[PDB]
Each structure stands twice: as C-alpha cells, then as structure tokens.
Amino acid sequence: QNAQALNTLVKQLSSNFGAISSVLNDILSRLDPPEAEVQIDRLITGRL
Amino acid sequence: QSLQTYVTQQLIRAAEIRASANLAATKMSECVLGQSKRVDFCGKGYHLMSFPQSAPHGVVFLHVTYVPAQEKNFTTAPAICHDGKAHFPREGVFVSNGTHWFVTQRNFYEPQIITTDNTFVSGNCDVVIGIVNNTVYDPLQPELDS
Amino acid sequence: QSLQTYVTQQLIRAAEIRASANLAATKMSECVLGQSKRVDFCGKGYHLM
Amino acid sequence: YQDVNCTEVNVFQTRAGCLIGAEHVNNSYECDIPIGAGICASYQTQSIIAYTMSLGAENSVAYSN
Amino acid sequence: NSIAIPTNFTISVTTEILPVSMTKTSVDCTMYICGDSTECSNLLLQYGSFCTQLNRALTGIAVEQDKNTQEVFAQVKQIYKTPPIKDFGGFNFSQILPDPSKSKRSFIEDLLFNKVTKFNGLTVLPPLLTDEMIAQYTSALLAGTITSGWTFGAGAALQIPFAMQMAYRFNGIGVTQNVLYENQKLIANQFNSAIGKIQDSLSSTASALGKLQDVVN
Amino acid sequence: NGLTVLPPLLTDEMIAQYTSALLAGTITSGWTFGAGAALQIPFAMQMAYRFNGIGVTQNVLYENQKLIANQFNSAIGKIQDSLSSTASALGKLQDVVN
Numbered sequence: 001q002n003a004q005a006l007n008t009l010v011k012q013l014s015s016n017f018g019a020i021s022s023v024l025n026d027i028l029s030r031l032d033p034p035e036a037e038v039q040i041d042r043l044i045t046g047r048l
Numbered sequence: 049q050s051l052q053t054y055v056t057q058q059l060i061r062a063a064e065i066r067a068s069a070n071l072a073a074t075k076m077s078e079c080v081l082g083q084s085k086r087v088d089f090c091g092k093g094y095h096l097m098s099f100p101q102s103a104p105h106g107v108v109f110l111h112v113t114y115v116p117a118q119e120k121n122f123t124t125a126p127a128i129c130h131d132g133k134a135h136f137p138r139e140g141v142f143v144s145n146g147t148h149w150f151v152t153q154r155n156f157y158e159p160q161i162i163t164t165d166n167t168f169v170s171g172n173c174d175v176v177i178g179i180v181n182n183t184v185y186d187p188l189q190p191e192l193d194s
Numbered sequence: 195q196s197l198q199t200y201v202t203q204q205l206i207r208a209a210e211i212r213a214s215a216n217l218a219a220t221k222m223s224e225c226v227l228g229q230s231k232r233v234d235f236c237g238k239g240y241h242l243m
Numbered sequence: 244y245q246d247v248n249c250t251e252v253n254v255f256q257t258r259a260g261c262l263i264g265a266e267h268v269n270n271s272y273e274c275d276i277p278i279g280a281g282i283c284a285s286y287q288t289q290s291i292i293a294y295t296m297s298l299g300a301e302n303s304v305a306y307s308n
Numbered sequence: 309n310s311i312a313i314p315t316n317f318t319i320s321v322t323t324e325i326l327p328v329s330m331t332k333t334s335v336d337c338t339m340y341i342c343g344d345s346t347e348c349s350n351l352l353l354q355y356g357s358f359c360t361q362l363n364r365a366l367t368g369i370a371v372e373q374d375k376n377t378q379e380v381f382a383q384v385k386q387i388y389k390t391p392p393i394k395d396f397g398g399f400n401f402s403q404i405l406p407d408p409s410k411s412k413r414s415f416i417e418d419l420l421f422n423k424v425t426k427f428n429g430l431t432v433l434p435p436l437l438t439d440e441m442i443a444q445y446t447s448a449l450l451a452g453t454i455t456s457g458w459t460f461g462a463g464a465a466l467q468i469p470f471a472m473q474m475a476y477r478f479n480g481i482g483v484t485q486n487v488l489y490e491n492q493k494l495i496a497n498q499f500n501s502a503i504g505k506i507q508d509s510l511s512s513t514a515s516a517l518g519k520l521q522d523v524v525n
Numbered sequence: 526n527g528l529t530v531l532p533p534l535l536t537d538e539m540i541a542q543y544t545s546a547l548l549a550g551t552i553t554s555g556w557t558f559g560a561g562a563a564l565q566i567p568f569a570m571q572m573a574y575r576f577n578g579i580g581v582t583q584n585v586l587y588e589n590q591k592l593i594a595n596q597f598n599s600a601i602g603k604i605q606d607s608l609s610s611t612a613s614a615l616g617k618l619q620d621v622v623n
C-alpha cells in the first residue's frame with residue numbers, strides 16, 4: 001500500500017495537468033516568465 | 049475535486065465503521081462466545097450472557113445482565129475476633145442484623161453461621177482496626193463430642 | 195481548497211480524539227466503576243482502583 | 244459483468260451480475276474467489292466453477308436437559 | 309461499619325446496536341466526471357493517475373465492508389443448530405431463534421429489519437454474505453451459545469443443559485450457583501418477560517436503531 | 526471572520542460535578558454503583574475486596590492498614606508536587622490545544 005501510493009505520487013510528475021509539457025525545465029527552456037508562469041501554475045495546481 | 053472530496057469523506061467514514069466493527073467483533077468474541085468480566089463492556093450490570101441478532105448494516109446484542117435490586121443495610125466488621133485469633137471471611141463478608149453475626153456472599157444476602165469452613169485465621173485481634181468479638185462455630189465439635 | 199484542507203484535517207483529528215475518548219470511556223468503566231485484571235491497562239503494577 | 248442482465252451482453256446470472264465462463268454447480272464449498280450475494284468461484288475438477296458458498300459444516304449439538 | 313447488601317435481584321436484557329458495514333459503493337470516476345464523451349475523456353487523461361486513485365480507494369473501502377461483516381459474524385467455526393425439543397430450563401428463546409416458517413430470521417431479528425430504511429457511473433455492489441447468510445451465522449452463534457455455553461468458541465461445542473450453563477454464568481459474577489437453582493423459575497420469568505419488553509420496545513419506537521439509521525442516512 | 530467557537534454542552538463546573546459523583550460513588554460504594562445500586566461499604570472493606578481482586582489475600586490489608594493508608598496518602602501527595610513543580614506532564618492536552 002505504501003509502495004503503490006508512493007509510486008503513484010511519483011508517476012503524477014509525468015502528468016501535464018493542462019500544461020504544454022510535463023517537465024518544468026523544458027517549460028523554462030521554451031517560454032518567457034509572462035507565459036511560463038501560466039504553464040508552471042497549472043503544474044503547481046496539479047502537483048500540489 | 050467533488051469526487052476527491054467524496055472519497056476522502058468516505059475513507060474517513062469507512063475508518064470509523066471499521067472501528068465500530070472490531071468493537072462489535074470483540075463484543076461478539078467476549079460477550080457472546082464468553083462472559084466478559086469488563087465493567088459496562090457487555091451492558092450495565094454484571095454480565096451473564098449475550099445473544100447476537102442481525103440488523104441491516106449492523107449487529108444487535110441482547111446483553112443479559114444480573115442487576116442487584118433490593119438492598120438492606122447491615123452492620124459490618126472486617127474480621128471477627130474469637131479466642132485471640134482474628135477470623136476473616138473466605139469469599140463472603142461479615143454482617144449483622146444488630147443481634148446475630150453472619151457471613152454472607154457479597155452480591156446477594158445469604159446469611160450463613162460463621163464457622164472455620166467459611167472463615168480463615170491470621171495474626172491476632174490487636175492488629176485489625178474495627179474488628180468485633182463473636183462466636184465461631186467449629187463443625188467438628190459436636191462430632192468429637194459424640 | 196484551504197477550507198477543505200482544514201476540514202479534512204479536523205475530521206482526521208476528531209477521529210484521533212474520539213479514539214482517545216472511547217479509550218477514556220473504557221478506562222472509566224473498567225477502572226473507576228470496576229477493577230481491571232487486564233495487565234498494564236490501568237497503571238503499571240496490579241490494579242487496585 | 245456487474246449489475247447487467249445476460250441478454251444485454253457457459254453463462255450464469257448471479258445476483259452480482261452476468262458471470263461468463265464459470266460453470267455453475269449445485270454443490271457448496273468454502274469461499275475462494277468471492278463474487279457477491281453468497282456466490283464464490285474457484286478452480287476445481289480442471290475448470291472455473293461458481294457456487295453458493297458454504298458457511299461451514301452443519302452441526303446439530305447433542306443437547307438434552 | 310455499615311454495608312448494604314441486595315436481598316433480591318433483577319435480570320435485564322439491555323439491547324446494544326453497533327454498525328458493522330457501509331453500503332459497498334463504487335463510482336466509475338471517468339463516467340461520473342466525464343460521461344459518454346471521448347472528447348472530454350482525452351482531457352481527463354491529463355490529470356494522470358487521479359481517476360485510478362479514486363477507483364482504488366473506493367474498492368479498498370468496498371472490500372473492507374465484506375471483511376468487517378466476516379470478522380463480526382463468521383467467528384463460529386461451523387453452523388451449529390438447536391435440537392427439536394426446546395428444553396432450555398424454562399427460558400424462552402423463541403423470539404431470538406430463527407423461525408423456519410419465514411429470510412429465516414428470528415422474530416426480534418425481523419423487527420430490527422422493519423425499523424430501518426443513482427446511474428451517473430455510481431454502482432452499489434452486493435455484500436459477500438447475503439442477509440440470509442448473516443441470519444445463519446447469528447443462528448449458529450446463538451445455537452452454540454444456548455446448547456454449549458462458551459466452549460464452542462474455545463474448542464468443540466460440548467453440550468451442557470441450560471440451567472447448568474446459567475449456573476456457570478452466576479458463578480462467574482461471584483453469586484453462588486444455589487442462588488440460581490433456588491430461584492430458577494423466577495429467573496426464567498424475569499428473562500422471558502425482559503425479552504418480551506425487547507419486542508415491545510423495538511415495535512413501538514424507531515429511535516432505538518439511531519446508530520444504524522444514521523449510518524444509512 | 527466567519528470562524529466561531531461553540532460552547533461545550535457540559536460546562537467545566539458541571540464536568541467537575543460528574544468527576545465528583547464518580548469518585549464519591551467509588552469511595553463510598555466500590556464498583557457496585559456501576560452495577561445499578563450504590564451499595565455503601567466502609568473503605569477498608571472495599572480495599573479488602575480490591576486486594577482479593579489481585580490474588581493478595583485480604584488479611585494482608587488489615588495487618589498493614591496504617592502502612593497502606595500512609596503509602597496512599599504519601600503517593601497522592603506526590604501528584605500535587607509533580608503537577609505543581611512541572612507543566613510537562615499534561616503534554617497530550619496542551620498538544621491537542623496547540
């Protein structure tokens with residue numbers, strides 16, 4: 001139960017939550033802060 | 049978010065029903081399959097026995113319990129002094145109706161004549177606070193006399 | 195979601211305090227209103243009252 | 244198939260739903276794979292069966308006064 | 309120097325009601341959130357494992373409801389049954405033992421049922437044990453308890469006549485067993501009439517089953 | 526600010542009336558006030574029933590009653606000293622308040 005709850009918490013880092021990419025270093029490689037803050041705030045809202 | 053809310057309340061509610069089960073599973077194993085010594089676990093009174101009955105999404109116990117019901121006052125003493133010996137009751141308690149002394153069981157008035165069967169000796173009459181003088185009948189005495 | 199987080203943690207905390215209230219109701223019945231032959235339930239040593 | 248009637252889908256209509264590929268038997272055994280409404284399934288003489296579970300051996304206690 | 313001692317007693321059949329299992333529920337979270345439309349479901353996939361967590365959690369709750377109902381009732385090893393001759397020393401279990409004319413519940417076990425009381429991906433699953441199988445376990449627990457004392461829990465269900473079983477129950481509370489035999493007909497009438505008050509109470513008011521009806525509500 | 530604190534149904538001066546009733550029952554009548562009837566019994570006879578409840582046969586109480594009473598009085602006196610000399614004992618209650 002602990003291992004499957006934790007592997008599911010980790011697999012949820014691969015999820016987009018409506019952001020343009022799953023990986024936060026790729027959003028910050030692609031976008032300027034006026035738009036990257038919208039994409040990152042979808043990832044914050046989802047991961048949190 | 050409304051489903052996450054529902055299943056979160058439902059995990060917390062399932063945890064408290066799993067806590068009324070275990071409580072019901074130990075009332076089953078102790079009140080039904082045994083006779084629990086545990087005060088107020090198997091209903092108010094001293095526990096005799098329980099019968100489980102089914103109910104939708106639950107269980108019902110009919111806890112049969114002995115309740116002592118018509119008390120009388122009596123004078124009492126922790127021991128009786130005899131020939132310098134102090135006598136203490138085995139399972140009973142000493143009582144008097146004001147004129148005679150008896151040993152009785154503790155949960156039902158059942159006065160018995162005080163004897164060396166229903167009492168045991170220790171020490172002497174000086175040590176015990178509130179000891180009272182009385183006869184102890186020796187069951188052997190009339191037989192050895194005849 | 196800050197209220198749902200607070201209410202969720204009060205629901206969990208209330209189940210923890212109720213597990214302690216059921217334990218206290220049990221100790222009151224089995225050790226105040228009685229005497230316990232349950233080892234270590236009512237203090238270390240053999241329980242008197 | 245939970246809650247369905249088999250007409251909508253070796254087939255058996257349990258109170259839990261339509262059960263396909265398990266042989267219904269009139270015997271009873273201890274439960275093994277639990278289904279619902281007293282039905283359990285198991286692998287037995289081999290193939291998958293389904294049956295009403297036995298709660299245990301019946302025992303008339305030899306009481307007299 | 310004053311003690312009060314009971315010169316008489318009463319036998320009370322106090323009822324206690326405990327909830328044991330919820331209605332087993334599962335919600336098909338994709339059809340609840342996002343029903344009958346692939347154009348929506350491809351958006352729900354962006355939330356990843358969330359819908360699997362909610363189906364997993366409701367399935368965990370749902371199997372615990374069978375586990376609870378088994379842990380409570382299935383304590384008896386084998387299904388004991390009562391003799392044809394109800395020779396229980398004057399005690400009258402006919403209101404708590406199963407009635408074969410009925411769903412083979414007892415009389416009181418039927419009052420307890422009469423006193424108590426959706427397609428949007430919602431499903432209600434059946435319990436593993438039918439309510440009639442629960443009524444076989446409560447019959448077996450009760451037939452052991454009447455014909456064989458406590459010893460059906462400890463080992464083999466050794467028979468013992470009921471007026472000797474209640475004398476072991478009296479000896480177990482520090483009342484000397486002759487107090488039962490000298491009062492056996494009175495003890496039987498106190499028990500039988502106290503059982504009669506359970507029918508009258510459960511028939512007259514629903515307010516007793518508040519613990520179960522609250523869990524349904 | 527939308528937040529509210531509701532009163533308990535049993536006021537603190539009314540919980541202290543139940544704890545008084547529970548120990549005033551316990552001190553005058555043993556366990557029997559749990560089993561319906563508060564049957565009075567003198568306290569050195571209640572303690573002889575409670576010594577039987579631990580397999581120490583009761584003449585051990587009477588032959589030592591002054592000692593047992595002094596050990597109880599001394600031991601309960603140390604609870605006042607403990608609860609006066611440190612607050613750290615109530616860790617569970619101060620924690621549920623925190």
Ligand SMILES: *[C@@H]1O[C@H](CO)[C@@H](O[C@@H]2O[C@H](CO)[C@@H](O)[C@H](O)[C@H]2NC(C)=O)[C@H](O)[C@H]1NC(C)=O
Binds near residue numbers: 148
């Ligand atoms: C205390 O108990 C004794 C024994 O029952 C009572 O003594 C008997 O009293 C009856 C009349 O009430 C007489 O017929 C018996 O002959 C007496 N027997 C003996 C051995 O004396 C006594 O009367 C009771 N005292 C009180 C105040 O109730």
Ligand SMILES: *[C@@H]1O[C@H](CO)[C@@H](O[C@@H]2O[C@H](CO)[C@@H](O)[C@H](O)[C@H]2NC(C)=O)[C@H](O)[C@H]1NC(C)=O
Binds near residue numbers: 129179180181
């Ligand atoms: C219990 O009975 C004994 C024996 O009769 C009493 O002991 C006598 O006490 C008086 C003074 O009260 C002395 O003068 C005697 O010498 C004692 N006799 C013996 C044999 O020791 C005792 O006082 C009685 N106690 C009570 C509370 O009744």
Ligand SMILES: *[C@@H]1O[C@H](CO)[C@@H](O[C@@H]2O[C@H](CO)[C@@H](O)[C@H](O)[C@H]2NC(C)=O)[C@H](O)[C@H]1NC(C)=O
Binds near residue numbers: 316
């Ligand atoms: C103890 O109480 C019971 C009642 O709970 C008494 O039983 C009654 O006794 C009277 C007088 O003999 C009868 O007229 C009644 O029919 C009996 N039944 C009831 C329910 O009252 C009993 O006599 C009392 N005494 C003892 C020692 O048992």
Ligand SMILES: *[C@@H]1O[C@H](CO)[C@@H](O[C@@H]2O[C@H](CO)[C@@H](O)[C@H](O)[C@H]2NC(C)=O)[C@H](O)[C@H]1NC(C)=O
Binds near residue numbers: 394399403
């Ligand atoms: C056990 O109690 C039941 C009542 O709950 C008794 O059944 C009644 O018996 C009389 C004849 O004695 C009939 O006139 C009634 O119609 C019966 N009532 C019901 C509801 O069946 C039963 O006789 C008692 N048995 C024993 C052995 O005491």
Ligand SMILES: *[C@@H]1O[C@H](CO)[C@@H](O)[C@H](O)[C@H]1NC(C)=O
Binds near residue numbers: 120121
């Ligand atoms: C016992 O006697 C006292 C008076 O000394 C009285 O107040 C009390 O009510 C009596 N109790 C019983 C059970 O008779």
Ligand SMILES: *[C@@H]1O[C@H](CO)[C@@H](O)[C@H](O)[C@H]1NC(C)=O
Binds near residue numbers: 177178309
């Ligand atoms: C009871 O109290 C009175 C108070 O004067 C005292 O004389 C008597 O010795 C006491 N009895 C016991 C058994 O302590």
Ligand SMILES: *[C@@H]1O[C@H](CO)[C@@H](O)[C@H](O)[C@H]1NC(C)=O
Binds near residue numbers: 248250
């Ligand atoms: C299943 O549906 C068919 C439709 O013809 C009907 O005859 C049958 O009674 C139904 N059985 C159940 C258990 O619903």
Ligand SMILES: *[C@@H]1O[C@H](CO)[C@@H](O)[C@H](O)[C@H]1NC(C)=O
Binds near residue numbers: 267268269270
């Ligand atoms: C089950 O019982 C029926 C009669 O009620 C019978 O026709 C059938 O052959 C039996 N099946 C098995 C597998 O025993």
